[PDB]
Enzyme design. Structure first.
Site, PDB file in Angstrom:
ATOM      1  N   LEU A 129       0.856  -1.190   0.000  1.00 41.13           N
ATOM      2  CA  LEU A 129       0.000   0.000   0.000  1.00 41.13           C
ATOM      3  C   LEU A 129       0.889   1.235   0.000  1.00 41.13           C
ATOM      4  O   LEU A 129       1.678   1.428   0.913  1.00 41.13           O
ATOM      5  CB  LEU A 129      -0.943   0.014   1.219  1.00 41.13           C
ATOM      6  CG  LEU A 129      -2.073   1.053   1.269  1.00 41.13           C
ATOM      7  CD1 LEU A 129      -3.277   0.522   2.051  1.00 41.13           C
ATOM      8  CD2 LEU A 129      -1.603   2.404   1.841  1.00 41.13           C
ATOM      9  N   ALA A 130       0.749   2.075  -1.024  1.00 44.96           N
ATOM     10  CA  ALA A 130       1.534   3.297  -1.123  1.00 44.96           C
ATOM     11  C   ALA A 130       0.770   4.314  -1.928  1.00 44.96           C
ATOM     12  O   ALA A 130      -0.104   3.956  -2.719  1.00 44.96           O
ATOM     13  CB  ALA A 130       2.875   3.017  -1.766  1.00 44.96           C
ATOM     14  N   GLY A 131       1.104   5.580  -1.717  1.00 47.82           N
ATOM     15  CA  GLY A 131       0.519   6.685  -2.458  1.00 47.82           C
ATOM     16  C   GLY A 131       0.370   7.882  -1.551  1.00 47.82           C
ATOM     17  O   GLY A 131      -0.435   7.861  -0.623  1.00 47.82           O
TER      18      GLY A 131
ATOM     19  N   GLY B  59      -0.719  11.046   0.263  1.00 48.58           N
ATOM     20  CA  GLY B  59      -2.072  11.572   0.465  1.00 48.58           C
ATOM     21  C   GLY B  59      -3.229  10.648   0.100  1.00 48.58           C
ATOM     22  O   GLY B  59      -4.389  11.057   0.140  1.00 48.58           O
TER      23      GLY B  59
ATOM     24  N   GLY C 125      -3.611   7.483   1.511  1.00 42.80           N
ATOM     25  CA  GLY C 125      -3.689   6.455   2.567  1.00 42.80           C
ATOM     26  C   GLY C 125      -5.102   6.089   2.989  1.00 42.80           C
ATOM     27  O   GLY C 125      -5.501   4.932   2.888  1.00 42.80           O
TER      28      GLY C 125
ATOM     29  N   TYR D 104      -3.041   3.108   9.740  1.00 44.32           N
ATOM     30  CA  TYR D 104      -3.796   1.879   9.968  1.00 44.32           C
ATOM     31  C   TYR D 104      -4.653   1.982  11.235  1.00 44.32           C
ATOM     32  O   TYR D 104      -5.836   1.611  11.230  1.00 44.32           O
ATOM     33  CB  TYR D 104      -2.875   0.650  10.027  1.00 44.32           C
ATOM     34  CG  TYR D 104      -2.068   0.426   8.749  1.00 44.32           C
ATOM     35  CD1 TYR D 104      -2.539   0.872   7.515  1.00 44.32           C
ATOM     36  CD2 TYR D 104      -0.829  -0.234   8.786  1.00 44.32           C
ATOM     37  CE1 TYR D 104      -1.789   0.671   6.330  1.00 44.32           C
ATOM     38  CE2 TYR D 104      -0.094  -0.443   7.627  1.00 44.32           C
ATOM     39  CZ  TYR D 104      -0.579   0.019   6.406  1.00 44.32           C
ATOM     40  OH  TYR D 104       0.154  -0.173   5.258  1.00 44.32           O
TER      41      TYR D 104
END
Ligand SMILES: [Zn+2]
Lengths: 222, 222
Positions: B166-168, B170, B172, B206
């Site tokens: 999971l990345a990117g 802004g 999240g 998370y």
């Protein structure tokens, strides 16, 4: 790595050891095997994110002792738990409880003497009992009058309080309430609490109470 | 400590190394220096609470590479994020994104070659795209059509899914919603995600989304 090496004044007298702590910074001397030599024990606490420092210290002979997670919760006062401020007559029982509950700490064998960890946490809780309006041990009692649980608290600054020790089988939720109550009474907005990375039961409890992670760290010793 | 030593077949072929992983079990042979000696790399993963295993492995010359926190989120009917299933044509862009964003895994220097981590995670995201209906990569696009965020997901069993990558920046919150929606759609109650102990930004996100800690572990290599 560059680092200053500073004697652990309090721990040296308390444990009868010749130990120091490393403080990594750009402006300090080079951290060398020679600088590390005149100590019976050297400690280092690094951000868990800093792999560069982790491997610099491991290459100098340091080993992982444990991981630490520091968390924070908003305050948010709540049901009066009925906790009371611990008094001097409670010190013997609290020392006995704390030395057992926190027997497996970063002061564990084989890094320190087998009795070191017990002594340290017994002193910690006694110091909280003999504290001040801003540094206390709070106790929850069972109906028998027995100690069901205890939590030590301290003011950090204008907005923050910190939980020192918190222990009491089946009493985690009410001990957190107690701590939140105490912080609110002092106009604090934030309550902080650190635990070992291995203490998943504490992590779960804190997060259930609304805590989130602030920082993560490794303790390494040589 | 008793453990079997098992060759890491897939990693040996992918990285071009000759490594093994330790499997601690009461049944296994004694873990000895002689048994460990011929392997170029030996890996071990232990619960962070198990200081006895930590001491035993340090006494066999293992070092810390990183700490892992595995978390789990309750799965419910969250809104749609607008994310889309990544296509074969998205692979080149995803491989480049993933190789850069996951360069500092437990496959990092100095333990593996500088390019190794990025190669590993580029392959991972590619494998996700080429997966089934139960292994996908989902993406969010900016106005320009450019990939703004991505998340890879797999079914684990009847009740659980797991986030892979999971990345990117802004993205999240949206990506978590995406992952929860995916799990919901497949009848799961539980969405699992692991992260590095040092990744406080991921931990915070998370936990903000409803995660709590399930387990903590150390990866140690020799
Ligand atoms: Zn070493």
């Amino acid at each position: 790595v560059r680092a200053s090496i500073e004697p652990l004044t309090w721990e040296n007298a308390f444990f009868g050891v010749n130990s120091a702590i490393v403080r990594i910074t750009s402006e300090a001397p080079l951290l060398t095997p020679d600088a590390l030599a005149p100590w019976s024990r050297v400690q280092a606490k690094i951000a868990a994110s800093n792999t560069g420092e982790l491997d610099a210290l491991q290459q100098l002979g340091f080993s992982l002792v444990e991981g630490e997670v520091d968390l924070a919760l908003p305050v948010n006062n709540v049901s009066d738990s009925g906790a009371v401020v611990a008094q001097e007559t409670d010190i013997p029982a609290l020392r006995q409880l704390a030395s057992a509950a926190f027997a497996q700490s970063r002061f564990r064998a084989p890094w320190y003497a087998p009795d070191a960890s017990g002594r340290f946490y017994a002193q910690w809780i006694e110091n909280a009992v003999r504290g001040t309006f801003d540094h206390q041990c709070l106790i929850l009692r069972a109906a028998s009058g027995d100690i069901r649980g205890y939590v030590s608290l301290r003011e950090l600054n204008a907005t923050d309080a910190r939980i020192g020790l918190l222990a009491g089988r089946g009493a985690g939720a009410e001990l957190m309430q107690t701590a939140l109550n105490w912080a609110y009474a002092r106009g604090k907005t934030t309550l902080r609490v650190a635990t070992q990375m291995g203490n998943t039961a504490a992590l779960k409890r804190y997060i259930q109470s609304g805590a989130n992670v602030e920082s993560t760290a490794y303790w390494l010793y040589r």
